[PDB]
């Protein structure tokens, strides 16, 4: 059991990006709502807290209770990762992004190729490509659901997750893809 999109949206929260966690070639907007992959020479202030191999950034807040919803503009991008993860995930590593390893994510691999990161991954039958994706976590019930906000349709739910300890949002704007995937992911208010 999982809500329709309007029900999920009633639990909207205010997510921001944690620029300190970020893979060092990522570039962040001032409001910490957008992240994109810069060229190989643009680097953030190095640190032992950053992702070193996976082009990933974590969001805030971390939480350990209730129902939480957020939405992300993906636009015409050709690759990205969105979802949630345990706050204890390892950052120095490349993590198979799986529930057992503490990740619940959906991934766009390329045009018309989307998967939920179960193991093995589950290909998603998306008819109308999403321009905005909604993520709904019900902590108590142990479910995380993904919505195609453009179509107003449910994409995928990880159920029986049995969450313990804090979870946080996770993002990747994907590889630059020869110029086709340079746009940022942008966290956006419901509307």
87 contacts 62 by C-beta, under 8 angstroms: yes
> For this experimental structure, what is the resolution in angstroms?
1.4
How far is residue 180's CA from residue 138's CA, in Å, rounded to a whole number? 34
Count how many domains the chain has.
1
| Closest among 150, 72, 138 to 106, alpha carbons compared | 72
Give the domain extent around 50: 1-191
In angstroms, the CA 111 to CA 76 distance is 9
Contacts of residue 23, defined as CB under 8 A and 6 or more positions apart, other chains included, come to 50, 51, 52, 54, 55, 56, 57
The CATH number of the domain where 164 resides is what?
2.60.120.920
Q: Is the Cα dihedral 112, 73, 105, 7 positive or negative?
A: negative
Q: What is the DSSP string of 47-74?
A: -TTS-SSS--EEEE--B-SSEEEEEEE-
What separation in angstroms does the CA of 103 have from each of 39, 128, 170? Answer: 27, 25, 9
């Amino acid at each position: 059991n999982v809500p329709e999109l309007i029900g999920a949206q009633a639990h909207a929260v205010n997510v921001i990006l944690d620029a300190e966690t970020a893979y060092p070639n990522l570039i962040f907007s001032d409001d910490l709502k957008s992240v994109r992959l810069g060229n190989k020479w643009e680097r953030l202030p190095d640190g032992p807290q950053r992702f070193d191999s996976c082009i990933i950034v974590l969001g805030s807040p971390s939480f350990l209770s209730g129902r939480r919803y957020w939405e992300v503009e993906v636009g015409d991008k050709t690759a990205w990762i969105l979802g949630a993860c345990k706050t204890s995930i390892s950052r120095k590593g490349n993590m198979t992004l799986s529930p057992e390893n503490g990740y619940w994510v959906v991934i766009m691999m390329k045009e018309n190729e989307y998967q939920a990161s179960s193991v093995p991954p589950t290909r998603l039958l998306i008819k109308e490509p999403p321009k905005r994706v909604g993520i709904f976590v019900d902590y108590r019930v142990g479910s995380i659901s993904f919505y195609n906000v453009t179509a107003r349709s449910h994409i995928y739910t990880f159920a029986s997750c049995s969450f313990s300890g804090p979870l946080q949002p996770i993002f990747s704007p994907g590889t630059r893809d020869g110029g086709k995937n340079t746009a940022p992911l942008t966290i956006c208010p419901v509307g």
